[PDB]
């Protein structure tokens, strides 16, 4: 038996006005070009407006504007994209575990697990750990000594928290994430690296998302700090003592070096790197695979790298870059020569 809702139930959830029959049953969501008659669609991007009248969707989330002249059933909302975002959860088939501790889970006698929490098979909860109400700990999770997960948290299978990791409410952590590991902390003695113990922890705020195989190092002395509402994609590396301001988003494969500070409402595109000990102010966007080498004090977008070219053309551009000092010297000599005549 598949999940099903009427257009009326869906419209109630997002405060939509149904212009058509509210009793139509809906079995899922789809984009305008993919949608069939049992699916609700949405128009967010003016670029996809071409596909609205030909869509086979049973109904479409629309602005009052885009609903005028439209022949199908409209669900009229201020913001179709946000309404889609809310409705998506009603069609999620991710399994939900019942409250309880799997018989194979190992829970230290002085760990506290809320009775409304679920702890999966072969999970390990260490001494002093605290698991809050409505938290779901997946199979094979390891929750280190004294670590805390706030109410409504969700950990996929195979998440690792080291000791002294404190997490706020409603965390979402995908499989393979490692939180509180020891980062690269070495002192050089005449060429031989000497380990510095990493004796800070991690503090994570509320409503944080952490993607698959993302690593967040513990602090060297004080904590690594992740603010509220921070969204981290997959394969991210956050080094020791990084600070991430509230509502910042980081796309996949981002790497942030030690002690960097990122402000609120920043957006780092995929594969961005930040060097250590710099600060980025609020409302900064960094485009894909940029290397950020210094502090940013002005809001706006920032970039590094070159345009992609066909390889033979790129090789010519790269050869000319190495000649730029020579070309600048030649341009200066030419200006002096023309001035003289």
């Amino acid at each position: 038996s598949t999940l099903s809702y009427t257009l009326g139930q869906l419209a109630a959830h997002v405060g939509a006005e149904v212009r058509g029959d509210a009793d139509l049953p809906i079995q899922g969501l789809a984009t305008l070009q993919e949608a069939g008659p049992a699916q609700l669609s949405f128009l967010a991007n003016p670029q996809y407006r071409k596909y609205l009248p030909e869509s086979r969707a049973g109904a479409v989330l629309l602005t009052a504007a885009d609903a005028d002249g439209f022949a199908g059933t409209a669900l009229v909302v201020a913001n179709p994209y946000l309404a889609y975002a809310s409705l998506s959860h009603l069609f999620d088939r991710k399994p939900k575990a019942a409250a309880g501790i799997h018989p194979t889970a190992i829970v230290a006698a002085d760990a506290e697990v809320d009775p409304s929490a679920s702890v999966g098979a072969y999970a390990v909860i260490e001494s002093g750990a605290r698991i809050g109400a409505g938290v779901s700990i997946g199979a094979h999770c390891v929750i280190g000594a004294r670590s805390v997960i706030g109410e409504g948290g969700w950990l996929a299978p195979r998440v690792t928290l080291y000791h002294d990791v404190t997490i706020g409410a409603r965390v979402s952590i995908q499989s393979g994430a490692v939180i509180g590991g020891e980062g690269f902390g070495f002192a050089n003695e005449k060429g031989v690296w000497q380990k510095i113990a990493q004796i800070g922890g991690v503090t994570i705020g509320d409503d944080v998302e952490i993607g698959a195989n993302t690593t967040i190092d513990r602090g060297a002395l004080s904590d690594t700090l992740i603010g509220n509402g921070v969204k981290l994609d997959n394969q991210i590396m956050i080094a020791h003592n990084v600070q991430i301001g509230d509502h910042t988003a980081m796309a996949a494969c981002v790497g942030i070096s030690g002690s960097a500070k990122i402000g609120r409402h920043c957006m780092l595109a995929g594969g961005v790197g930040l060097v250590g000990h710099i600060e980025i102010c609020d409302n900064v966007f960094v485009t894909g695979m940029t290397m950020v080498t210094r502090s940013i004090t002005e809001p706006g977008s920032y970039s590094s790298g070159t345009a992609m070219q066909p390889a033979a053309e790129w090789k010519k551009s790269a050869a000319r870059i190495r000649q730029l000092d020579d070309m600048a010297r030649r341009l200066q000599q030419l200006e002096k020569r023309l001035a003289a005549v």
Copy 2:
């Protein structure tokens, strides 16, 4: 007791003609410069032809051409590299598990495991999952609800499949891979990110390889699609709703943003990034650490970045790049000035 074959047994496996004694016992494979008399070698690259007459190998896989004038035992084949590739499997010491389910594995009552499959210690197989004939599931694997693995599949220890992941035949997945995780799917409401449930799945074709700690996100609505014969190296990130055509290879640390479409027989070198919502046609090669920012409609090689220089020279080139608009303006003024005289 070590693996051992005669030159005759090896030659039979690849259809080689033995020019010398077929009874010579062989204990392994080696490159021409490393090989000793108990090892079979091969000449693939004309650059290594220098090392052929001095090689201590017991025998060498050779073309008819390179076997003429050669003093040792030749195994004569059309393609020495492909023959090496085939013979390597005869000397693999990777352990093979016997059919059966380890007593500590947890298998849902309505999961189906073929009796010829092996399921390792502390594996978890969820409701509705299907494990095909001759499949090997390593220790600590987690196989989500309704997920499918086709015949002859091999999962290393500690592979995670989320729910609704469908895999074709003869998959090979290395440890730490995460398939079907929730990718970065958020709607921005006045600076606050709102989660979009990721309610598509993943469809993987036949003869696919997935390397260690590689992540492949589930689709937002429809599936993320990986074609037949696709080979993915380690630490790759495949975002939601990516489509990868048949026989495409991607080297390590590649990141593909959401909804990108890659054609057949493409090759992405290490650390390549693709932005979202672009298409690459068939037979495209992208060189290492290139950022692909737009659709590619012509087959061939493509590149971005700069040449490596000594740091002091690089710093001068990077300073001149920032002056290029000024230099272009100055070159234009000079042309106008010379024209006028």
Copy 3:
């Protein structure tokens, strides 16, 4: 009850001279600006000397030079940073497991575990594996067939060693690391990739650190080789048959392609990539996100990429780079034209 030492106990550990009262109790370490009166601090960087007289630290590790004129308690040492590095371990709260094998660990009958080793819950130790004295194997580790870990080794929870991985003494491996996986080894037959079995192993030296979710591939024929004292940060990818010389450090998100050889005392900054089959000599530094495309035969620093600019300025620089061949041709025509007049 918290860890506490007197200034005298701390000074004895690093050979410091206490200029003040040796009986002062110390509960931790802190930087000069963060430190309170129960904490020991240090002055390493001349840039932080501003903050020395105003620091609330109970005492400070100082050179004889910086101790002259200082009003507080000094612990006088040759090298405050190295003394900090040594003292950090005295304040580490990482849990230490007692010797023994957890009842849920699975240990092959012909594996050898030293009785002073600790093996955590749900660990799997395969046939022929050898675990040395004082080794700590975390929960959910998998130690493949015939693999060896030398005395004093520490594996976090959820480390995977494949078969035929040999590790020297005093290894430190963070969670999620995968050692000995099969790397991208394929032969192309008219567009179809054919697997090459990866039948080498891995050899790791003494005093090696491996960070979280780092992958180190096994060799194709001979071993992948990691020297003594090599320090690898998180999310690193080491491909098949790489050789890393002693005392080399690699920051996070570094990727080294197959068969590359790195010398002794090298330092690769974060996100560096190396192409395959190249050699880097001793004492080479490569700056962040550089693509190394050829062998380096001269010690020193090396870089690639461009300076970060505001996006609109970057777009202008990137457009001019594509015009450099045209600009060079125009500069040449102008020189010829001026010469002629």
